[PDB]
Amino acid sequence: MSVQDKQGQNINVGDTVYTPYRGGKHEGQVADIVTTKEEAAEKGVKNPPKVLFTDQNNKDVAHNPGTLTDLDKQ
Amino acid sequence: MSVQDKQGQNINVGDTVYTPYRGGKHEGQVADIVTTKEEAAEKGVKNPPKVLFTDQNNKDVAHNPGTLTDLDKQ
């Protein structure tokens, strides 16, 4: 089933997601949603679920869904 | 302090690093060594030190240096 953001909204591939940190943000479009330990291992990430997206500085980020915001579902 | 692999070898940018998982591996050349909180946040990773590399399937991996092997330094 679906993975949800910090506002309970289903996250889809291609959606713009956002997470802030002290000094900046990571914002960009979802490329993949990883939900099993095996898929996480294959994609080189840890602790699913992970939302994989490229941010505004062209950095590939893997982030937990429950602490980001899907801007397209706001 | 330098950044070292699981065999205590200093890792350099460009070195092939390797980590196995059940069903595959992640192997590729180090592109960046992240040691500061500032750079970790900019690159969307946690808990420096991290070594950043693209694996043989074009997955961008961020990994603890001390839990992988620097193949070029064997």
Alpha-helical runs (H) found in chain B: 37-42
DSSP B11: P
Peptide bond into A48 cis (omega under 30): no
| C-alpha to C-alpha distance for B29 and A24, rounded to whole angstroms | 28
Yes or no, beta carbons of B23 and A44 under 8 Å apart:
no
Q: What is the largest CA-CA distance in chain B?
A: 34
Disruptive mutation site among B17, B43, B67 for chain A (greatest number of A CBs within 10 Å): B43
3-state secondary structure of B50: strand
Elucidated via: X-ray
Q: What is the CA radius of gyration of chain A?
A: 11
Q: What is the largest CA-CA distance in chain A?
A: 34
DSSP A48: S
Buried b / exposed e along A18-54 (16+ C-beta atoms within 10 A): bbeeeeeebbbebeebbeeeeebbbbbbeebbbbbbb
Q: Nearest CA to CA, how far is B41 from chain A (Å)? A: 7
Measured in degrees and rounded to the nearest 5, phi and psi for residue A3 equal -100, 140
Interface check B50 vs A, CB under 8 A: no
Residue B25's identity, in one-letter code, is: K
Yes or no, beta carbons of A41 and B23 under 8 Å apart:
yes
Domains of chain B: 1-74 (2.30.30.1060)
CB B65 within 8 A of CB B51: yes
